[PDB]
């Protein structure tokens, strides 16, 4: 019957640039009397709930809680939460199969038509399932010519450049290229370099 | 109590510190049990070590108030697989300091002295060590053909070492098909890294 707070310390953090629902509770006090402020972003109410949307990664967030029912102004403690960057995403190629279903290529073999129809590179948390949207700022494709030289080709933002497209078009079955130097941005406002993926032409 | 709602997650195979608190009750008066793995008191925290991935762990809490044990409401938590690690090459610089190569340029001597590949989370949290089960190195010949070479567990095979030894400055190779294992007992395939010989 009485409520104990069971909080894993690795999970008791706020993430910059996303919805952070927080259960702010005062024993024996109805939701309508509780009032809260934050020194990193916004703290708006969603009924019983509180949504923290902090902005500065690494800076600590101070949650001041006040209530009016007793004396004059009851001062609560005064809690501090760590504001972390979102996890770093992984690159993928979003393609449509022959039945028109959307799929995510995450390494291995992929048809030339599927690569070119995708038109570029994407980045997301693998988990996934929804949940946070990341953007590809830029990336390189590394090709290998007939002389065995590495040919790094710069992108057009998240899209393949015309030089990249020409290189992909002239690849034979079983030839390989690498998606490298992938720069991804998240709603936390953080830019990150993420790992490479190998693409084998089908 | 100011608690982020999405927090009923424990990771299998590692220590999960939990702040279990009852308002107005001293830590020593709080007792807790788990139905999945172990739950050990350590200072002001309880350390959960659950075992099966995809299962639920129920934490039962009691509080002592005078001569009476009060049963608190039970808490259900999801036991999850650990996050997937990223590959790196552990090398020693010219001053003998241990460094983690995570892509870019690396000297041939540093690659060979490392003797193999490692895998870890690219984050201060959690307290986790992963193991490289197997990997491939993909080299490119003068005809532009890819030469995939199989490892000796986490170590470079003799064929890999010979290929690395004959690489000139500016030549590239790829660490691919990296299979890693974690203390959650899960095997995962992780992304590639490009190595540019400096």
């Amino acid at each position: 019957e009485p409520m104990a707070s069971v909080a894993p310390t690795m999970m008791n953090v706020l993430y910059a640039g996303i919805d952070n629902p927080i259960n702010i509770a005062v024993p024996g006090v109805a939701q309508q009397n509780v009032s809260a402020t934050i020194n990193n972003g916004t703290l708006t109410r969603r009924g019983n709930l509180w949504i923290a949307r902090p902005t500065k990664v690494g800076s600590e967030a101070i949650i001041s809680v006040t209530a009016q029912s007793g004396g004059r102004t009851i001062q609560m403690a005064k809690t501090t939460l760590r504001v972390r960057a979102l996890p770093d995403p992984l690159p993928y190629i979003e393609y449509k199969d022959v039945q028109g279903n959307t799929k995510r290529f995450k390494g291995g073999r992929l048809g030339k038509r599927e690569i070119l129809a995708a038109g570029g590179i994407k980045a997301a948390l693998d988990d996934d399932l929804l949940e946070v949207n990341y953007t590809v700022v830029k990336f390189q494709l590394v090709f290998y010519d007939s002389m065995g030289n590495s040919i790094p080709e710069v992108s057009d933002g998240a899209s393949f450049s015309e030089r990249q497209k020409r290189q992909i078009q002239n690849l034979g079955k079983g030839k390989r290229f690498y998606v490298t130097e992938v720069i991804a941005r998240g709603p936390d406002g953080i830019e990150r370099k993420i790992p490479a993926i190998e693409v084998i032409v089908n | 109590s100011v608690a982020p709602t999405m927090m009923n997650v424990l990771y299998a195979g590692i220590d999960n510190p939990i702040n279990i608190a009852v308002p107005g009750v001293a830590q020593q008066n709080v007792s807790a049990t788990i139905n999945n793995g172990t739950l050990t008191r350590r200072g002001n925290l309880w350390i959960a070590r659950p075992t099966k991935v995809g299962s639920e762990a129920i934490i039962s809490v009691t509080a002592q108030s005078g001569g009476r044990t009060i049963q608190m409401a039970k808490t259900t938590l999801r036991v999850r697989a650990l996050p997937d690690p990223l590959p790196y090459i552990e090398y020693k610089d010219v001053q003998g300091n241990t460094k983690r190569f995570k892509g870019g340029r690396l000297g041939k001597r540093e690659i060979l002295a490392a003797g193999g590949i490692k895998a870890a989370l690219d984050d201060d949290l959690l307290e986790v060590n992963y193991t490289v089960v197997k990997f491939q190195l993909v080299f490119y010949d003068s005809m532009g053909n890819s030469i995939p070479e199989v490892s000796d567990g986490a170590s470079f095979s003799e064929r890999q070492k010979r290929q690395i030894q004959n690489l000139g400055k500016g030549k590239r190779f790829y660490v691919t098909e990296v299979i890693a294992r974690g203390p959650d007992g899960i095997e995962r395939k992780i992304p590639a890294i490009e190595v540019i010989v400096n």
């Epitope: 291995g108 693998d126 | 991935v53 095997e187 995962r188 395939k189 992304p191």
Partner: nanobody
């Protein structure tokens, strides 16, 4: 483009044993998680078993645990399903699968997910009398 061809299906008496084989085309077998699903008449498709890239991790359906064994031979590009103590409930079309070519973990949950496998076999009929 990987093609899977199963063999070894047929009629077997209850309590009996049968080994199914599945040969994969190409030279990338080692990059896949290999497995088996089964389809009985008037029943939902059920996951049977799957084996990790290295062979170090295997997942079995509860109904086959301790009766069926999976193994892989990378040199022969073949996955095997050894069925022992066969029951009439094991009567089904058995289909070999290959997936997990890209990054991602091999959990009990992902092993059971039909959407995690890009390549599916022809199916082989197993009849337990």
């Amino acid at each position: 483009q990987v093609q899977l061809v199963e063999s070894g299906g047929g009629l077997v008496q209850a309590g009996g044993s049968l080994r199914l084989s599945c040969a994969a085309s190409g030279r990338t077998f080692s990059s896949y998680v290999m497995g088996w699903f089964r389809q009985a008449p008037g029943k939902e498709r059920e996951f049977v078993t799957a084996i990790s890239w290295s062979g170090g991790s295997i997942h079995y359906a509860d109904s086959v645990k301790g009766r069926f064994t999976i193994s892989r031979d990378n040199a022969k590009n073949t996955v095997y399903l050894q069925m022992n103590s066969l029951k009439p409930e094991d009567t089904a079309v058995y289909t070999c699968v290959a997936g997990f070519a890209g990054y991602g973990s091999f959990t009990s949950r992902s092993a059971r997910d039909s959407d995690k496998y890009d390549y599916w076999g022809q199916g082989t009929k197993v009849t337990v009398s």
